[model samples]
Target: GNWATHVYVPYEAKEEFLDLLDVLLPHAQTYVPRLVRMKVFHLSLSQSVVLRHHWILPFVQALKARMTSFHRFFFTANQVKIYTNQEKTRTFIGLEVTSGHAQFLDLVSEVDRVMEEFNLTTFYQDPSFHLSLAWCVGDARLQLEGQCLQELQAIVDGFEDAEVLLRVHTEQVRCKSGNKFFSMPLK
Candidate 1:
């Protein structure tokens, strides 16, 4: 059986993170009433790809080895922005990272090498790299952008605790293979 795999840095949500969501989610919903808050948060390092069942172990090994050199780093995602999938089928409200983008690029380069070893496609050429906060089905960009986007940005800017919650520490790179999860801790 083939398993869908994705590599990402997990955002360790704290009580403060939930508190931030309490404000952000409802505000975003006012623009697109159907928008749902993300149950889990992460900064994706690789696009979702298929992996052979047998390749799973070797894949994790490669990822672990490659990830071993990276130390813990902090990233800040305080800017509110809108994003739609390449096909524009789904739109997302997210906190685009303003700091520590270069570190993420390094991680992606390492992950891309592993993908190449498996003859799989690599990460995005120029990734936007943000933690998705909320979403809705279909192209909702028109409804959520312009004045609505400006309002969301204002909320983030005014939220005193935004930086505290949005500046997250990345300790591990995790790979999800079907129902199983493999964690690769940074050194």
Candidate 2:
């Protein structure tokens, strides 16, 4: 069997983070009322690719080994921006990573190695690490850009507990292959 697989750092949202979302979502909905919230947030490490079932075990083992030396770290995601998929079929409202970018780059370098080993597609040359909060169908950039975007940024900046809420602690890196999941904790 073939599995659709991708790698990412899981972001466990705190209660306060949920509280923040309560405000952000409604405000964003003002511009695009059709926006829907993201079910599970994560910072992607690799593009989704095909992996044969027999290769799963080795892949997890390899990923685990690579992450053994990667220690727990913190990163801040404060800036708000709008994004669109490659095909421009969908648009997203996301918090862009401002700090801890170096650590993410390091992790991506290692993840890229595993992807190369399997001859799979690697991550973007210049990745924009972010956790998408909400989305809407089709390209809404024109509607969401400029004034709306700055307004969203201002909201993020003015949110209560901005510092505490914007920073994220990554405990583990996860890989989702089909319906199965794998986790690799940092050292």
Candidate 3:
């Protein structure tokens, strides 16, 4: 569930997310403690390593070409992710979900199939297949408990309409720090 399995993300994308922290921090201290929790909860930069656009684009293109009639057959945008670190080493994929059933299994199977077809494999650094986020330096149970967890869960659950499927090209990676963020295009 943490980077122990693997660190995945698009380093550049993480930079952009990190950059946004500059804007989010002020609110973190003043408005909602939940905001702080959200920051910590999603602090992992490992998700970016899941896959690269270069290899992924061809998969999407082929999938679209072959199954244009089936919308669910297409790659889910939220299915992919970005990560942040001082320096990126191995790339990986979040082969599972962080919370809830949702479409975790389906996404993982799709990714596995795509990788096998391409003769590729994820960093597989961590067997769990999760990209770590911020503020989770220790066990999750200790970090998220009681009211603190309720707040975070409310926020996480509130995003019921959140769109995980991405239709556009992933040309850039974004990461965030404190509050502000920066982005680098993967070209």
Model 3 regions lying over 4 Å from their true place: 1-57, 66-69, 72-104, 122-143, 154-187
lDDT of 3 by residue, 84-181 (tens): 23343322212134442233343334434544565545323443333233322222333233454344334433433344312212233333322334
Better of 1 and 3 by TM-score: 1
Candidate ranking under lDDT, highest first, comes to 2, 1, 3
Residue-level lDDT for 122 in candidate 1: 99
lDDT per residue (tens digit) for residues 65-96 in model 1: 99988888888888888999889988999988
Model 1's alpha-carbon lDDT is 0.88
Which regions of candidate 2 are displaced past 4 Å?
none
Off by over 4 Å in 1: none
**Model 2, span 57-82: residue lDDT tens:** 89989999998779998899988888
Error of 2 at 41 (Å): 1.1
lDDT, model 1, position 153: 82
